[PDB]
């Protein structure tokens, strides 16, 4: 996670279907200093349920 | 400390001066995935002790 998270040069991002680990994957965000106001995020359905 | 460690761009990290902080800072740079290969450290006394 980390050494994924440690090449990304993007100001957005894009998502995957699943919920609970979207749960989760923010938590490791949170965990890794993402979240603030660097990226901003679409949700598609399914993530939002 | 991650917020400080998001904006690193070096290749190399030059050091203070204590040395438990050095080891808990050695902790925080594995915990945030900068210990690898992308740095390279040059250590003064009173770190190495």
Do not use: D, H, M, R
């Not at 980390?2 to 749960?23: G, V």
């Not at 989760?24 to 598609?44: D, Q, R």
Request: with cysteine.
């Amino acid at each position: 996670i980390q050494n994924q998270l440690k090449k990304l040069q993007s100001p957005i991002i894009l998502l995957y279907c699943t919920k609970e680990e979207a749960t989760y994957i923010f938590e490791v965000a949170n965990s890794v200093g993402l979240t603030g106001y660097g990226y901003t995020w679409i949700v598609p359905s399914l993530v939002a349920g």
